[PDB]
Amino acid sequence: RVSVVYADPAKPLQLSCKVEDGCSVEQAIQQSGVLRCCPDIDLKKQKVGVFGKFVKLDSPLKDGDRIEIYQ
Amino acid sequence: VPWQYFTSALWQYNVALVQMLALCPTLAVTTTATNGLGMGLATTLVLVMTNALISSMRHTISPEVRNPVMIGVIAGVVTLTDMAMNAWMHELYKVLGLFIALIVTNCAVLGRAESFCLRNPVIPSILDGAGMGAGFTAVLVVIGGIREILGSGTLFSQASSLLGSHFKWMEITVIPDFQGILLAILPPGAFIVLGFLLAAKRVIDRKRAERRQ
Amino acid sequence: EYVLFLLGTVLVHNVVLVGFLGLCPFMGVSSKLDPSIGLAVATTLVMGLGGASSWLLEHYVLLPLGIGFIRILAYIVVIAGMVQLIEMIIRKASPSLYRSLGIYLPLITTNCAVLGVPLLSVREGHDLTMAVLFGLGSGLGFSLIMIIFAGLRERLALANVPAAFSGPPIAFVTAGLLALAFMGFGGLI
Amino acid sequence: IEATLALTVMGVLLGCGLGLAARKFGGVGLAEKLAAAPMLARVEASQCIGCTRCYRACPTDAIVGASGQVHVVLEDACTGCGKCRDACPEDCVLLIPQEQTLDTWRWDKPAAA
Amino acid sequence: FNLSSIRGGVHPAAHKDLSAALPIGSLPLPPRLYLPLRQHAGAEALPMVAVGDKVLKGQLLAFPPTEVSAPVHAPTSGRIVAIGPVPAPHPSGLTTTGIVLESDGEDRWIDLDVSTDPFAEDPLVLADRVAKAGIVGLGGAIFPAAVKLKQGTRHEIKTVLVNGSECEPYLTCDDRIMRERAEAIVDGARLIQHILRAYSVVIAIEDNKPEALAAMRAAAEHFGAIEVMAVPALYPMGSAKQLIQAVTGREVPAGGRSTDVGVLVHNAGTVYAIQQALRFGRPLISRVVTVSGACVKTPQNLDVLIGTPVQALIDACGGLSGDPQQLLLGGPMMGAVLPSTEVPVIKGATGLLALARHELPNKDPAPCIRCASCVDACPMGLTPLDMALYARADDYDGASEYGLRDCILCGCCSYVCPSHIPLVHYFQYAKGQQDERRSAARKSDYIKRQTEVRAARLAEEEAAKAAAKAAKEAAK
Amino acid sequence: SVAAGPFAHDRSSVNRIMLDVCLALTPATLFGLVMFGWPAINLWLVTCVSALAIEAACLRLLGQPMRRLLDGSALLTGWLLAISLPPWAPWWIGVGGSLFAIGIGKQLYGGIGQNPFNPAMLARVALLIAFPLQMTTWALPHPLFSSSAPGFFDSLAITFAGAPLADGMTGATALGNLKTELTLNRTAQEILEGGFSTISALFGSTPGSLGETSELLLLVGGVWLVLRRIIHWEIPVAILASVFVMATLAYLINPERYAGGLYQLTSGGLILCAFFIATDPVTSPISRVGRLIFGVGCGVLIYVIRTWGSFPEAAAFAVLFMNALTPLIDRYWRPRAYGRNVRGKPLVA
Amino acid sequence: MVAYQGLSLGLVCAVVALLLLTGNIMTHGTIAEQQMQDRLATLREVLPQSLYDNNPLADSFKVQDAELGEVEVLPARLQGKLTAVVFQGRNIGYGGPIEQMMSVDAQGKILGVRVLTHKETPGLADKIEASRSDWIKVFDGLSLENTALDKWKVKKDGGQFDQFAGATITPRAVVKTVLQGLQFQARHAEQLKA
Numbered sequence A: 001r002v003s004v005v006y007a008d009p010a011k012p013l014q015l016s017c018k019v020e021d022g023c024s025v026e027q028a029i030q031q032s033g034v035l036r037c038c039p040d041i042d043l044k045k046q047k048v049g050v051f052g053k054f055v056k057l058d059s060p061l062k063d064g065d066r067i068e069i070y071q
Numbered sequence B: 001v002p003w004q005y006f007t008s009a010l011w012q013y014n015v016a017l018v019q020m021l022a023l024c025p026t027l028a029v030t031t032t033a034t035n036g037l038g039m040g041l042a043t044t045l046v047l048v049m050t051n052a053l054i055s056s057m058r059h060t061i062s063p064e065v066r067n068p069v070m071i072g073v074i075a076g077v078v079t080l081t082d083m084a085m086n087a088w089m090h091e092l093y094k095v096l097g098l099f100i101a102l103i104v105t106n107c108a109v110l111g112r113a114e115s116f117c118l119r120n121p122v123i124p125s126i127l128d129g130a131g132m133g134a135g136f137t138a139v140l141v142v143i144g145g146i147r148e149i150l151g152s153g154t155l156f157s158q159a160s161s162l163l164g165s166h167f168k169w170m171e172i173t174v175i176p177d178f179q180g181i182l183l184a185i186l187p188p189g190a191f192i193v194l195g196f197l198l199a200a201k202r203v204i205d206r207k208r209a210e211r212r213q
Numbered sequence C: 001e002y003v004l005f006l007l008g009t010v011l012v013h014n015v016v017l018v019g020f021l022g023l024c025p026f027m028g029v030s031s032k033l034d035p036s037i038g039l040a041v042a043t044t045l046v047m048g049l050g051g052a053s054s055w056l057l058e059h060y061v062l063l064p065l066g067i068g069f070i071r072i073l074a075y076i077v078v079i080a081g082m083v084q085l086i087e088m089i090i091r092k093a094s095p096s097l098y099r100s101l102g103i104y105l106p107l108i109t110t111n112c113a114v115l116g117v118p119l120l121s122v123r124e125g126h127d128l129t130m131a132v133l134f135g136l137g138s139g140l141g142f143s144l145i146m147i148i149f150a151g152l153r154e155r156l157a158l159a160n161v162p163a164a165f166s167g168p169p170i171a172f173v174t175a176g177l178l179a180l181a182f183m184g185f186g187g188l189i
Numbered sequence D: 001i002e003a004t005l006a007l008t009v010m011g012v013l014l015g016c017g018l019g020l021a022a023r024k025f026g027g028v029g030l031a032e033k034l035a036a037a038p039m040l041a042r043v044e045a046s047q048c049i050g051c052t053r054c055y056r057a058c059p060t061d062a063i064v065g066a067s068g069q070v071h072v073v074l075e076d077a078c079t080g081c082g083k084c085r086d087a088c089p090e091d092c093v094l095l096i097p098q099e100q101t102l103d104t105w106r107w108d109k110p111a112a113a
Numbered sequence E: 001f002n003l004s005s006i007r008g009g010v011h012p013a014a015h016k017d018l019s020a021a022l023p024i025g026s027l028p029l030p031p032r033l034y035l036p037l038r039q040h041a042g043a044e045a046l047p048m049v050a051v052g053d054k055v056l057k058g059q060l061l062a063f064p065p066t067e068v069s070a071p072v073h074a075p076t077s078g079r080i081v082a083i084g085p086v087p088a089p090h091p092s093g094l095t096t097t098g099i100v101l102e103s104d105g106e107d108r109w110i111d112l113d114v115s116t117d118p119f120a121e122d123p124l125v126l127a128d129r130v131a132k133a134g135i136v137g138l139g140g141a142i143f144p145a146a147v148k149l150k151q152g153t154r155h156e157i158k159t160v161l162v163n164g165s166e167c168e169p170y171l172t173c174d175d176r177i178m179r180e181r182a183e184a185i186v187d188g189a190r191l192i193q194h195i196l197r198a199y200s201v202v203i204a205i206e207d208n209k210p211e212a213l214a215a216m217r218a219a220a221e222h223f224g225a226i227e228v229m230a231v232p233a234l235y236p237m238g239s240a241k242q243l244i245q246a247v248t249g250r251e252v253p254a255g256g257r258s259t260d261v262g263v264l265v266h267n268a269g270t271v272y273a274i275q276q277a278l279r280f281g282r283p284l285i286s287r288v289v290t291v292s293g294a295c296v297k298t299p300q301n302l303d304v305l306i307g308t309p310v311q312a313l314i315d316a317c318g319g320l321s322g323d324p325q326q327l328l329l330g331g332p333m334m335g336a337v338l339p340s341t342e343v344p345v346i347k348g349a350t351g352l353l354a355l356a357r358h359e360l361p362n363k364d365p366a367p368c369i370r371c372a373s374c375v376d377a378c379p380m381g382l383t384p385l386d387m388a389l390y391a392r393a394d395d396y397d398g399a400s401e402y403g404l405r406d407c408i409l410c411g412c413c414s415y416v417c418p419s420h421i422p423l424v425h426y427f428q429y430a431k432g433q434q435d436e437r438r439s440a441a442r443k444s445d446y447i448k449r450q451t452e453v454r455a456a457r458l459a460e461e462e463a464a465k466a467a468a469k470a471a472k473e474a475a476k
Numbered sequence F: 001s002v003a004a005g006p007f008a009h010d011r012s013s014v015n016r017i018m019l020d021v022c023l024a025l026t027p028a029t030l031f032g033l034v035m036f037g038w039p040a041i042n043l044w045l046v047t048c049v050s051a052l053a054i055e056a057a058c059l060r061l062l063g064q065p066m067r068r069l070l071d072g073s074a075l076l077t078g079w080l081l082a083i084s085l086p087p088w089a090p091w092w093i094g095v096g097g098s099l100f101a102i103g104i105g106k107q108l109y110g111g112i113g114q115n116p117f118n119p120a121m122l123a124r125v126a127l128l129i130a131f132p133l134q135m136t137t138w139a140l141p142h143p144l145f146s147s148s149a150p151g152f153f154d155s156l157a158i159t160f161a162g163a164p165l166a167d168g169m170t171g172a173t174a175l176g177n178l179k180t181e182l183t184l185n186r187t188a189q190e191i192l193e194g195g196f197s198t199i200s201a202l203f204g205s206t207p208g209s210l211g212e213t214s215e216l217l218l219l220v221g222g223v224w225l226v227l228r229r230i231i232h233w234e235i236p237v238a239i240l241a242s243v244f245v246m247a248t249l250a251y252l253i254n255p256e257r258y259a260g261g262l263y264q265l266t267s268g269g270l271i272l273c274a275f276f277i278a279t280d281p282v283t284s285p286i287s288r289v290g291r292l293i294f295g296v297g298c299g300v301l302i303y304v305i306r307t308w309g310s311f312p313e314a315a316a317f318a319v320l321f322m323n324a325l326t327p328l329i330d331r332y333w334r335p336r337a338y339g340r341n342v343r344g345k346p347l348v349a
Numbered sequence G: 001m002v003a004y005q006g007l008s009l010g011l012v013c014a015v016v017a018l019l020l021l022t023g024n025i026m027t028h029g030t031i032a033e034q035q036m037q038d039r040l041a042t043l044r045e046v047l048p049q050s051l052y053d054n055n056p057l058a059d060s061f062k063v064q065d066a067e068l069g070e071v072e073v074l075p076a077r078l079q080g081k082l083t084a085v086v087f088q089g090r091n092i093g094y095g096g097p098i099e100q101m102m103s104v105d106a107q108g109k110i111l112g113v114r115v116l117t118h119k120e121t122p123g124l125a126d127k128i129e130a131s132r133s134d135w136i137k138v139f140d141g142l143s144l145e146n147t148a149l150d151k152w153k154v155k156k157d158g159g160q161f162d163q164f165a166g167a168t169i170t171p172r173a174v175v176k177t178v179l180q181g182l183q184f185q186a187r188h189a190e191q192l193k194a
């Protein structure tokens, strides 16, 4: 149970997805389906953070975390 | 200025027209203007004496037994008033009946004795009591006159027998040769007249506020 | 019989519409039904107790000693004290009960009814039982009239009364009309 | 006399009873009384240079974003408290009244009868 | 069984005989369709395509972000030109997020994922198949059918009720959809009975539709447990809470669902859509609407694609033979005034009534005379006069006590009011104010919890970092 | 501004209801007017015109639209007050009654739909209390064009101005006569055997009010109103049944002091009050049990004040008392909702 | 301490009681004199001064009969020869019992009748009072000699006394009270007749 946020100024998106405990940011984003909402998302280029701190794709996440994809 | 209280209590804070107090004698002894005038004068005298006594006895009342003390300071005085007007104003005493004795429980008397007489000197308390009594007397006179005119036509009657022959000049007659509406004298006629007076007071207050604006 | 006496006190000789006693709290608290019911119960109990105490005081202390003119003072003084006790004893022993009787109890320390009824009952020379019944009947009439008037005013609050009559004046007019309606019971008992 | 003594006895009894009751356990009118537009933040595309001061002064989690030239944007959690107005050196926050939308539409009261 | 008797109800002029004669017509493909992204109840779907993409008839344009939602499918093949603001079928006239699809005109179906022997799989598979079809309960409540079926499966269902008792005046879509497609409706009822392990289906129609009753009885005579019932001709009879009482005899408990009494209610169009989705895999793309009124040359029933503008429907039925006064989207008792003729047709659109001046009553509000004709007509047994009195004085809390919670806004109040009073308008205003207060309280609670959590986590992180730094300098 | 539904409405209106009530009152009013002659016509016309004029003036003062004068709520009050008054009464009685009703009773509370008391009965009680002499003078039936009734200008002098009614044109009715002869140590049987005929009293051939005399045309009008869904049968049925049951019980217990049944039903304004006056919508309960309680209370009070009271008839007093008691009945006997018990808690299933 | 409250209440009560007893001993005699004067004023309206010499409210001799019960006869002797007797009668009217006073002379002629207490309907039967009508002044020369037991009734019952327009029960009660008083005086001779 976490959230994924796209900080696009044109359209700030926020989704909530339930993920298996011990997951990673990559798999959480893949399960959340934010990729299909915005095909212009580059998961290797754009910055991915947790609560405002730059993080790594396979970093473990806890319950109540908030993954954010921004410039 | 001490005279501010006397003028302010007349209309700004009326006992029977603003604070909604002293309604029992307002509605009961009002079938004649003379009855209202006598009741108002007696109430004014009792208020002045009780306010003076309470203010002179202000720094002696225990906070927790304040009522049974001050009530006594009222009650005996009221008794004396009865024992006065039963002996030298018997004609008026026979008319008022129970409500001359029912001044101890008059909400206006105890309210003024508690609210103002426990935190003010003797002179301001006396002036406040005089103002409240004057306002009550004015309201009683107005209601009694309206009811008496609606019921019999005459304005002020048997004043010589009640208030003394010296007041004989007050016996005037309005609408000569009038049998009168009997409902005004009866209890249903008092509440309606009081409600109409309250509505008139509200209307004139609004119009005066508009004029001041 | 006593049922006829009680009914005559309640209806034919109502302490408010034909007695003009206790009108200030009656016209001040009747805006809401629940305070009206609470004050009705409290004033019924207080009037019963005050009638009993006044009869005992008059027929056991005042008249035997020869002093009768004092009665008024004595009456009210005792009543006042009693009310205070009936407040404080119910302001700790039963905190829950201090929401239906204790709150409205100070309203009737000086009501003109708790003193009008004993004075009226003195002139008729009632015994103890008759005095207690007279007090209870006056309290019941006060309670019934207060409840009916509270219902009427609560319904009138949500009506289109003109702005120059909404509030106290319409209450006084309604009370006058209610007294006119009650006038038909005259002479029944 | 035999009457004043009795009256005084009754009085002192009542007084002592009241006192002991107070130990162990105003006005009529006052006693009767007892018985009875939001705004939201706004961030442009130029006045924000990623100085992260707005997130720094925002007790609510309204502003999202960090770093520089990322154009932090608010959320629905804003309340218009103004903690981010003076925070931005370039005066980026542009608090505005909330706009009417379909989901915030309510029926209007009938005029009169 | 035996029909019980519901309490209250009125008998408005049916006006169903002027349009329930011609068969269901067809529409030429309009140039562009406006598909709002929120044609259902709950959360709003999120688009999956971009501007300029090529889509086929049946592609999934938008997908549900949560459990309680419904996807949006492309009615016809074409090119997406906008993902932006579109007019909405609302009395206000405000815009909503939605897609604009330019109809190519080829009208080519996508490679649908058909099933095989639907009476072979477990109920959950059929439930998710309906979930990935856009079925939204074309009855007015626009509640997703998949969620309702899933909630029904967990409980015990003793009867599946098909709500074929079309009751609104001027509306005859259900009448024709049952006259012409009885077999499909029966098959859908059987599929629903298989999904929810139940006893029998009790398909109900009003007695003012003899043709529909005859067709349904002819279609369903060999399957056994299927039953056809003729409910009376009462206005608030198509409601679930009243139809359940009329059929079963029980009353749905207040603040509870219809599954408590073990009965599930589905509209006659929703059953057909479910049958189509299960048998052929076709998603919910087009529905049946009724165009009627004195201002229409030829009232008819049209098979309309979702997103088709209203003006196309009006032009199809001859045209406006005169000047309208109010254009209603649904029955007169619950319709909404259309802002203009450019508004599209959502899945919940039931009718396109064009009422003239002699069909609309003229009113002149007068003070309430307390005739108590509202109490005798309210299906829920409420006191509408007291609720209106409390709502006019802005005492919503006191209005809720008299039955504002249980009001269904059926409109039986204002229909029998001698002094014409907008009682339903007062109730809607009070409910809107209560909803606004509830939303404000919910936002306040949410923001307070978020602030508390953020402050706690920031404080604990700062304390941990300070302790770590203090430990580091000690060893230095 | 957007319009809100529903966009359908039946053929109903306050004007139709009030005019149908007046139509139901028409036959008994005609029977009363023809029987008593020109003075009754003069009084009825004066009362109705004064009621309409005072209603117009009050509407002008309050700023309410003048269209409220066209709903018939004032004409009906004037009609009921006029048919409630004595026949050969002076004009000022009717004018004052109309002023006291339309005015204090109705317009002082806001207008139609706001008053808590019955206006016509309020005016009747006020007139009876204020002017007992003019409200206790009943004229014997002097039929129109009967060679014994007064002419047109003689009737004008009777109604307007103060010309005495001479002698032999005024008598006692039934209830007051029975009570007086009971005070004359005569048992309740001899009074009714030689001074009361049920057949003649039922038709309306006895002195009384203007329209109260006939207990058959009023019954026909009430039945027609009941069939038209304008009034509810609960109140009239309850009032009549309660009065009849109590009267019959009293007659059976002590026949030498109580008269009951037909005598009680065919005397006073019992039927008129039961059908046209106790069924006031604005001052009656909106429920069913509430209406039954209202009717039972009205009947019990009417009979009690009739027999043991100081008045020969107390329909107005009973109606006013039950109008006072109405709000509690409304707030304590609300109808059961859907899916909830009587206490209001949700049902369990 | 609690002693202060009790002492204060006691002192207030004692001072008030002392003042009240002083006022009572000052004014009780005047109150009694006023009550006696009111009684004499009530009596004087039916009994002229010249007829009586002694104090009428000093020789009240209660008598007992078979119908009225017990009476309160006050004599009006001049020099020992009885000239008038004043008593009271009660009889049921319409709104309740009516209490009236009679002043029958030594020869049976009525010197005046006044109604003391009544609860009749105002405006309809209030003419019995002497301040509004002269009807109560009809009984001023009548007796049991010049008026037999046939004219002592209202005109409704076949007598000679007028009845109020719209009210007959009250005149009936008043006439019955007057007749009963005269008959009671006739029955008790000597002491009440002379």
Ligand SMILES: CCCCCCCCCCCCO[C@@H]1O[C@H](CO)[C@@H](O[C@H]2O[C@H](CO)[C@@H](O)[C@H](O)[C@H]2O)[C@H](O)[C@H]1O
Residues within 6 Å of the ligand: B045, B080, B081, B084, B088
């Ligand atoms: C305020 C609380 C109560 C305190 C009251 C204060 C006012 C009291 C005023 C008392 C007036 C004193 O005035 C009092 O007048 C009365 C009038 O009857 C006189 O009384 C007189 O009665 C008669 C009639 O004239 C004479 O025959 C007699 O000789 C004389 O006593 C008293 O002798 C006198 O004492």
Ligand SMILES: CCCCCCCCCCCCO[C@@H]1O[C@H](CO)[C@@H](O[C@H]2O[C@H](CO)[C@@H](O)[C@H](O)[C@H]2O)[C@H](O)[C@H]1O
Residues within 6 Å of the ligand: B041, B042, B045, B081, B084, B085, B088, B089, B090, B091, B092, B160, B161, B162, B163, B164, B165
């Ligand atoms: C401010 C006054 C308030 C009045 C109530 C307070 C009680 C006051 C009691 C003391 C009043 C003394 O009042 C004074 O007494 C004399 C007698 O001496 C009265 O004198 C007169 O009174 C009565 C009144 O019915 C007359 O009928 C009578 O002819 C005569 O005795 C006067 O009315 C007045 O001049």
Ligand SMILES: CCCCCCCCCCCCO[C@@H]1O[C@H](CO)[C@@H](O[C@H]2O[C@H](CO)[C@@H](O)[C@H](O)[C@H]2O)[C@H](O)[C@H]1O
Residues within 6 Å of the ligand: B176, B177, B178, F050, F053, F054, F095
């Ligand atoms: C809503 C409609 C209201 C209509 C109002 C109509 C009011 C006027 C009625 C017609 C005029 C009556 O005019 C009235 O006549 C009477 C009797 O002659 C006279 O009145 C005079 O004598 C009567 C008693 O007889 C008493 O009221 C009084 O002594 C005096 O006013 C006056 O002249 C006037 O009060």
Ligand SMILES: CCCCCCCCCCCCO[C@@H]1O[C@H](CO)[C@@H](O[C@H]2O[C@H](CO)[C@@H](O)[C@H](O)[C@H]2O)[C@H](O)[C@H]1O
Residues within 6 Å of the ligand: B196, B197, B199, B200, B203, C162, C163, C164, C165, F061, F062, F063
């Ligand atoms: C000797 C007269 C004694 C009067 C005693 C009774 C007092 C009655 C006065 C208040 C009556 C209320 O009746 C009426 O109320 C309305 C409120 O709608 C007031 O207001 C009305 O008139 C005013 C102009 O004057 C308009 O601007 C206003 O829109 C209209 O409502 C009226 O001025 C008052 O006449």
Ligand SMILES: CCCCCCCCCCCCO[C@@H]1O[C@H](CO)[C@@H](O[C@H]2O[C@H](CO)[C@@H](O)[C@H](O)[C@H]2O)[C@H](O)[C@H]1O
Residues within 6 Å of the ligand: F153, F154, F156, F157, F160, F161
């Ligand atoms: C529209 C006008 C107003 C109508 C309402 C007020 C009416 C007032 C009527 C007062 C009646 C006075 O008393 C009445 O006077 C009329 C004339 O008026 C007299 O009438 C006399 O003159 C008329 C013509 O004028 C003759 O036709 C008639 O034969 C003759 O009797 C009556 O004999 C008398 O009984």
Ligand SMILES: CCCCCCCCCCCCO[C@@H]1O[C@H](CO)[C@@H](O[C@H]2O[C@H](CO)[C@@H](O)[C@H](O)[C@H]2O)[C@H](O)[C@H]1O
Residues within 6 Å of the ligand: B179, B180, B181, B183, F092, F095, F096, F097, F099, F100, F126, F127, F130, F160, F161, F162, F163
């Ligand atoms: C109490 C509720 C109703 C309130 C009604 C409003 C008051 C109505 C007027 C009440 C007047 C009572 O007083 C009454 O006045 C009228 C005038 O109208 C007098 O009437 C006198 O003059 C009128 C003309 O004006 C003549 O027609 C009449 O024959 C003559 O007697 C009555 O003799 C008197 O009894």
Ligand SMILES: CCCCCCCCCCCCO[C@@H]1O[C@H](CO)[C@@H](O[C@H]2O[C@H](CO)[C@@H](O)[C@H](O)[C@H]2O)[C@H](O)[C@H]1O
Residues within 6 Å of the ligand: F027, F028, F030, F031, F034, F035, F141, F143, F200, F204, F205, F206, F207
């Ligand atoms: C369409 C509705 C009906 C319209 C009917 C209109 C016509 C009505 C005529 C009947 C009314 C008057 O007709 C009749 O008059 C006579 C006098 O002759 C009255 O008087 C008769 O009966 C009464 C009984 O109380 C006695 O005085 C006596 O036996 C006789 O005089 C009757 O009580 C009345 O019934």
Ligand SMILES: CCCCCCCCCCCCO[C@@H]1O[C@H](CO)[C@@H](O[C@H]2O[C@H](CO)[C@@H](O)[C@H](O)[C@H]2O)[C@H](O)[C@H]1O
Residues within 6 Å of the ligand: F192, F240, F241, F244, F245, F248, F251, F259, F260, F261, F262, F263
């Ligand atoms: C109205 C709706 C409710 C109906 C309820 C019916 C319940 C009671 C039914 C049995 C009633 C018997 O009622 C009985 O009838 C007789 C005639 O037979 C009536 O008696 C009648 O005739 C007698 C003499 O014979 C007269 O003195 C009497 O004044 C008259 O009323 C009484 O009213 C009652 O004694």
Ligand SMILES: CCCCCCCCCCCCO[C@@H]1O[C@H](CO)[C@@H](O[C@H]2O[C@H](CO)[C@@H](O)[C@H](O)[C@H]2O)[C@H](O)[C@H]1O
Residues within 6 Å of the ligand: C004, C007, C186, C187, C188, C189, F304, F308, F309, F310, G094, G095, G096, G097
């Ligand atoms: C809400 C329902 C109430 C039901 C009330 C039931 C109780 C009333 C009926 C029983 C009382 C009957 O009352 C009986 O009748 C007469 C009038 O006829 C009453 O009244 C009588 O006495 C009183 C007191 O002196 C005077 O008003 C008068 O003399 C007379 O009216 C008596 O007190 C009693 O003798």
Ligand SMILES: Cc1cc2nc3c(=O)[nH]c(=O)nc-3n(C[C@H](O)[C@H](O)[C@H](O)COP(=O)(O)O)c2cc1C
Residues within 6 Å of the ligand: E136, E137, E138, E139, E140, E141, E142, E143, E148, E163, E164, E165, E166, E167, E168, E236, E238, E239, E240, E265, E266, E267, E268, E270, E334, E408, E409, E410, E411
């Ligand atoms: C006023 C009112 C009118 C209704 N009219 C209809 C109707 O005409 N047809 C119908 O099938 N259901 C009608 N209903 C019931 C609901 O619209 C719907 O049947 C139920 O809530 C869900 O059904 P679905 O899941 O099949 O959409 C009505 C309900 C109300 C309150």
Ligand SMILES: Cc1cc2nc3c(=O)[nH]c(=O)nc-3n(C[C@H](O)[C@H](O)[C@H](O)CO)c2cc1C
Residues within 6 Å of the ligand: F017, F018, F021, F073, F074, F076, F077, F080, F106, F111, F112, F113, F114, F115, F117, F118, F119, F120, F121, F230, F231, F276, F277, F278, F279, F280, F281, F282, F283
């Ligand atoms: C059935 C019915 C009975 C009525 N009865 C009365 C009545 O007894 N008195 C009256 O003044 N108005 C009566 N009215 C008129 C209307 O109800 C009355 O004006 C209300 O009091 C308006 O406040 C009646 C109206 C109807 C429809």
Ligand code: SF4
Residues within 6 Å of the ligand: D043, D047, D048, D049, D050, D051, D052, D053, D054, D055, D072, D087, D088, D089, D090, D091, D092, D093
């Ligand atoms: S304070 Fe201003 S410049 Fe800095 S991040 Fe916030 S909006 Fe951008």
Ligand code: SF4
Residues within 6 Å of the ligand: D040, D041, D057, D058, D059, D060, D062, D063, D074, D077, D078, D079, D080, D081, D082, D083, D084, D085
């Ligand atoms: S106004 Fe307050 S809550 Fe809103 S964005 Fe700025 S700091 Fe956050």
Ligand code: SF4
Residues within 6 Å of the ligand: E377, E378, E379, E380, E381, E382, E384, E406, E407, E408, E409, E410, E411, E412, E413, E424
């Ligand atoms: S709209 Fe609500 S209150 Fe009115 S009849 Fe329908 S359910 Fe009852």
Ligand code: SF4
Residues within 6 Å of the ligand: E367, E368, E369, E370, E371, E372, E373, E374, E375, E384, E385, E416, E417, E418, E419, E421
């Ligand atoms: S239908 Fe209209 S007038 Fe009748 S009770 Fe309901 S709101 Fe009042």
Ligand code: FES
Residues within 6 Å of the ligand: B021, B022, B023, B024, B025, B105, B106, B107, B108, C021, C022, C023, C024, C025, C110, C111, C112
């Ligand atoms: S209750 Fe206030 S003076 Fe009587």
